[PDB]
Symmetry: D2
Subunit: 498 residues, 4 copies
Amino acid sequence: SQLQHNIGLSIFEPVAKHRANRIICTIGPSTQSVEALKGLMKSGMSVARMNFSHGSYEYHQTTINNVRAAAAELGLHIGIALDTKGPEIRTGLFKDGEATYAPGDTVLVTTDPAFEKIGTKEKFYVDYPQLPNVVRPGGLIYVDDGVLTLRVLSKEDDCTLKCHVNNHHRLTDRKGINLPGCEVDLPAVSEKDRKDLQFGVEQGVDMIFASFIRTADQVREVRAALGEKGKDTLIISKIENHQGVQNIDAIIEASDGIMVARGDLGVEIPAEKVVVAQMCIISKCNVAGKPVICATQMLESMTTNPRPTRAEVTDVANAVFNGADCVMLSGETAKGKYPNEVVQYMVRICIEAQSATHDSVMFNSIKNLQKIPMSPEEAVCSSAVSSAFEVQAKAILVLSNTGRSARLISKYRPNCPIICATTRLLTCRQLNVTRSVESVYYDVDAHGEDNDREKRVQLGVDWAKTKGYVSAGDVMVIVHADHSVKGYPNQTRLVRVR
Amino acid sequence: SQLQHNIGLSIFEPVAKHRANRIICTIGPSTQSVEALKGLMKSGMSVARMNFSHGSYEYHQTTINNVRAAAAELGLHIGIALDTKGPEIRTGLFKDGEATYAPGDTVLVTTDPAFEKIGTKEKFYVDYPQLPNVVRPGGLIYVDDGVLTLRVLSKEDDCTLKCHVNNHHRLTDRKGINLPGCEVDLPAVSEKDRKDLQFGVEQGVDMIFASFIRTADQVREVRAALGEKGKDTLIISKIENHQGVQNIDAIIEASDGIMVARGDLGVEIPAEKVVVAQMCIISKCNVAGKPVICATQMLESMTTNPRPTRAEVTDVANAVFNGADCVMLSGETAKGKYPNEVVQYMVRICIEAQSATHDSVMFNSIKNLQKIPMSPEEAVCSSAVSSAFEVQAKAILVLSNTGRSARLISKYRPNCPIICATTRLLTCRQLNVTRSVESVYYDVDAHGEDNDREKRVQLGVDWAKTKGYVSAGDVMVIVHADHSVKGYPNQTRLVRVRE
Amino acid sequence: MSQLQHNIGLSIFEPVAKHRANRIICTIGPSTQSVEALKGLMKSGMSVARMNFSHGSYEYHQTTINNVRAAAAELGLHIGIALDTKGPEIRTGLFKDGEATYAPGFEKIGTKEKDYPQLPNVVRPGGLIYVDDGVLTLRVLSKEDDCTLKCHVNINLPGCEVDLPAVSEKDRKDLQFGVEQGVDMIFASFIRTADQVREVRAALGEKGKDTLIISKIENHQGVQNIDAIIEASDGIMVARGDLGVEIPAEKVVVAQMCIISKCNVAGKPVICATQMLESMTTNPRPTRAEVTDVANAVFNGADCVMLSGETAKGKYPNEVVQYMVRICIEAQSATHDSVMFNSIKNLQKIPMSPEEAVCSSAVSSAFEVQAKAILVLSNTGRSARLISKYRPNCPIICATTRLLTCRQLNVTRSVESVYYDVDAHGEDNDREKRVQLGVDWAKTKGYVSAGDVMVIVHADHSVKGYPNQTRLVRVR
Amino acid sequence: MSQLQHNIGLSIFEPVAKHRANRIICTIGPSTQSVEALKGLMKSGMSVARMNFSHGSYEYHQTTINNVRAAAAELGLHIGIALDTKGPEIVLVTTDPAFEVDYPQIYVDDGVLTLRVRKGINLPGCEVDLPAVSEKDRKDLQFGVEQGVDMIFASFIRTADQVREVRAALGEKGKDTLIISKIENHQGVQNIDAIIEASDGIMVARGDLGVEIPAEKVVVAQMCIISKCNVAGKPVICATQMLESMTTNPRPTRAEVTDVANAVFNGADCVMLSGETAKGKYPNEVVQYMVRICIEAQSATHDSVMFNSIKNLQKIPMSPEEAVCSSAVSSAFEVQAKAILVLSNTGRSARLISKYRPNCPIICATTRLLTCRQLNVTRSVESVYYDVDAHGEDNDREKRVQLGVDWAKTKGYVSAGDVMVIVHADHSYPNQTRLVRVR
């Protein structure tokens, strides 16, 4: 039992030498420079995020080129994630840049472009032109990350609502709007989102972080926005509304992975419900075998402080226990005063958490929740993990060009690292979002065609030996395909190193 | 499996109608007033905490008298906890209240009382007089939440150390130094802590929160510091050092409960290790059947903000999930701008986490880790919990004068509340540290002898039916003694609530 | 938690259990009808005496009744009497002057050449038709006139559902005799529909309302309709004799396991029934097969184990009951842990009634304190059957005010009844006399002593109608 | 997991397993010595033909050998021959040989006669001294080895040293012949662990065990021994009065059916017939019933419960050899494999797969014939002999693998569109596992 496990935890036992969890960092003014990115990488960055809510294509081209430059110097394969703006709505601008609100007062909330830049404490503009028709009296409007709440009194006009101010707050220029009990009805791929998606496909982004995914058809709408050119790019759906959590199963099947975007989720749903929502989403992704990311205020204090609160440490730790592949940072790396220090702290917590959770428990929990019969592919991948547990394998080597097999091995959560002998550099980059994987790129062009995939295996074993994972005499589980078939692996080997 | 449980959780299902976890609040300038305390209680303050590291006995007498006045207004029995200063020390005062330190610089750390109030960026005072002989060169001194680090260069004299500043920091008057890794000769109950504990006992404090407990002998030192007048007051030992974690089992046996004081623990041991330490301590206390408290930076952002971070919410929920009886509020309620708002937020998180863990998993886990044979007292108590689970009892009623039986029922973590028909007020206050319990005091003087135990039972069932726990037509598990060999409840009844 | 991990740690040469939990049911025939033979059987292990109504006049069954009551009275025991009905069965009588021969390839005057009127209509073309123990078979040549059909040499109709009354004209007279006599339970033959059980329940009037109905599963229908049969009954008998012929012999093992476990979860007494120690009808010791058969019937979770002809027509009747006792105690001693208890409790749907929640918790309390015995105050025996449902390791003492329930509790495992005479000792409205009677009986019968903890289950101060109170008492 | 939860829910009239996993061992006597009675037994379901050496001349036992080989040859089967050693063998009773049991330094025939201070005499727990390999036993074993008997059923094994005494009696020639130790005493049960390690398999000889120990204790002894052999990964046989009534009757008692089923349920690889086939009036009829019961009991315990029970009782880390074989079984469970193909020459790889009790058969592509006859004692293995001198060398996973696949298709185990698990050794002991669709 969990209780029986906790009572026997050895706090001062030696930690795991090889980090299995992955860190995603958003890139902003503090970390756009090649030197700052080299620092982030050297610190523990696996995927560099670009928030497309703000920034020109020139600004986002700089992040792309700099990540490629920094990773090239360090000889790493770092993924680039395009985080879409999505069906998001903010307020207008304010006359003299501010507006103070007192409780008991009344504010007209217009969708009239005349008040777009002339917003006062008496009347102000909001993006959504369908807002007076969506929000009905009694309904609450959550201006600025729910710190200002407005109850709807009446729809005075065609495109204006009279609202009663609940709490004292001073708002400023262009701040986000949330509608909790309101079914929005807005496009997932807006005309801006569409072009944002054609830019990334062109310049080669590895994955998409689709904002405000509500339905299974919404993740399909994004799939169509990336053409045959962007057919292989991953779709990580961001759950940040009530509809998303409600339709989580459909969204999971349609997506390549999921992000528990806790920022907007904590305002769209009550703050206390986010914990239960996170646990439930992460475990559903675990059973599905799809990468799940944790995302907001994980180490928020470290944007201004050199050390995190006791709350942040237990947050990043429990994100790992709940089963997250990745953990992300937003303000911290992008606008923070300690960007390398925050990634380093996250690394220490992730290694501590994974050392406490060195278990065959997650593997058995996930395996038992899978339907029988399995596919020969999955049956080989799950047994490769059980073989590793039985022989105490120091590493699992998978030959996966697309990364399916590597994601399928990682699905069964082994304690050892997973080395992936891939031929595609896109896959080395896309596997930065999957727990325990360590990709190795085989350059097929420079050498030979390689009919018998023996070179790829020797490349993996040698990389595992030199990177100190394996040492002479250790047993290693090799997974690949036989030379009579292709498409998917069907063979598993247990090899003592040389 | 936990996986199979999480998968079927219903995010938007209605929450539990009755809160089982308990909230402990530190009292400071923001909440010392009767009106502010009335707000905290009405908010959910179960234990008023007095940090004796700061404040005169007159200031701490005000907190006592005001807590009693406030709980009297709402007709509640709120426990008062005396949190000892203890062994480990704090720095001196500073000239103009502040002093900024830059890396690569040098600071002289004196133990000279002349610099006690005139501390500059060049030289400042520290409480520990034995410090220059304990800290040897190359050793680090940890100042202000272990933020500022000072590497000892050399021993200047009889009571001074020259230190090389590692990081940029500006600290203020009387902020703690930790120095982890040194053979520190500071006692558990110093001459100040004996006067502090003797004050508590003379005042009637319900429990003690003993600071920097390392050994089981230290607990007995504290137990001896409270005399024959303080023989029933609880001893909650604070684990905030490497030794205390290492000797956790011995301290658990010696104590009445444990506090995971994460503040000093996070500096004495690496920050990441505190999670593992918390899980391990809480579960050890669960198996033992002793109240465990989680504390330090639980909802820290709410000292200045009206809403907590996404991290603060998962911290309070996992403290509950880990098996903590209580969750504590330190500066959030003492020096915070939102004291009622922070207790209210903690309440909703505790109820959410509670509603998600509405299972027999914990009881099963705890019960299986008990060695057989059990005492008839514990076998009646554990079976009273299993009976409740089987019939879906909406409440368990225990007749416990000392609270032993109520602490023993709560040990097996039932999903329903535990009503305790106690003849003691001290018991009503001390049971604010144990999960699910809701005490009911039977007069005995302004009532009868009730030798037959019937009046207390009728007082119990009436208190639940009124406080809305039970509704006419649903069972209740009643635990008490049946007129025989003194020393334990031995009888369990299953009764349908009448009208 | 594995059975494998349990088997590896079995200490075969360890000491056995001090008190036998499983119950033995014996058939009474020419070898054991005498008071002396019955006194021998009881001292040997018998708890219920069976009266096979397939053969015998009401005078003959009256001597079994009177003699069982006499023998039990001398030994001061409360032995139950079971009426096993003739039931619905197709027949064929005495052959060529008592016996002849049939080679492969007037319904009682056949030799070897040429009952149910619904036979050509109930049985469709093709299939199997059984004659004389199922041993001889019948391959129907063509569809024929009257009732009988022309058959080729290669009683019972397999797989297929038959239309025969549950309470035949003979059974009606039998059941009415039983009720008038005061028989404790009925062993209803060839139960196929839960409606048939209620037909039997209606055959015994308000006079026979309290008598138990143990349904005998011995056909395909009874097995495929088990669940409803287990709800309308008071207990079940795995009548393996006719079951082994109605269904393939190999299927009976799986059918036995499945029926016994279903009865365990239901909390109803289940009885294993045919050829359990068959060799001991002629030999002083059993085959290696029969010993493993009795043991596995106990292992499967059977409350009772039965002897049909071993005790009725056997040459070693006391010797066979004694062997069954040794096996039952061995199998019991090997089945020491709370595996069955937890097994059964986890399969119960929540909420439980306060009555069953008190009973199941009384068993868990016993497990926790290592109770030497559980004392239940049960007039009807419901509560005692409910405690036994959760399979405790210790005995259950039942302080009952009714002799009928002292006799009916011989079918429930771990139960030892104690009769409190109200008309003699008093009304005991405070229940202390029946409690002190139970503790004293457990002290003298050596179950408990000084220092031992005992779990005491009964009804409290206000409550009337069901037990709701549990006590843990250290015997003084 | 929960036996109760599995039993409630069993569907009595569900379709049975098409392929029998459990194995039947028959003693050969006057009723079944003829080639045409043996062909009948083999068709009925005889996997191992036993020869009780307590009775019979070497001429009589040579006839059984030659006839078993003849009958198996006609039917194209590889039937193992087991030599059941005599071992240590024990009113007027004055020893005095002239007045003519065999012990000159008390029960008669399965416990009928008794008293207080050529019929099987048994003195329960008297310090009775007699060697494991007596002068006759050494002569019986040397005959067996010279004849080619596959396995030895060593009588009255009490110590692990006794097993090594028997292993030395066969020597250099009989190094490869299996040693199945018969537990039929008190200390043979007491020293079971030592005896298991020393042996190749165990027999629960319930005949003498039921007399040496109380009759009721044999059930507990059987369960305990079979499960110890299960964890060890060594063939265990159940043995006496299995279907005893069928020596004279065409049908068994309800007790005999539950006894055979229980033996299977307990985890026995094999189940044995003694008199029933040797001196019985219904020898083919008794093997046939035993088959029906074994298939019914198998069908009921179709589950991964035994596999998980055995796997969890193995200490970690496992050898790459056992980690491949146990994973081959879990892969089979996951994909619902219609078979497991193992390329085992000794059979040690096939015994290791059978150890983890899969629901599907284990086809063994063996280069030996001795392996084909010795694998009649392990459950689920259906051997296929590859003639190296006839086809080729075959050091590559090709010809044997093809023969094994073609055999499983013609014998109806696998058809086009079914997944099979192939276990063998790579190019650079087995270390490789393949999951192949039969095509």
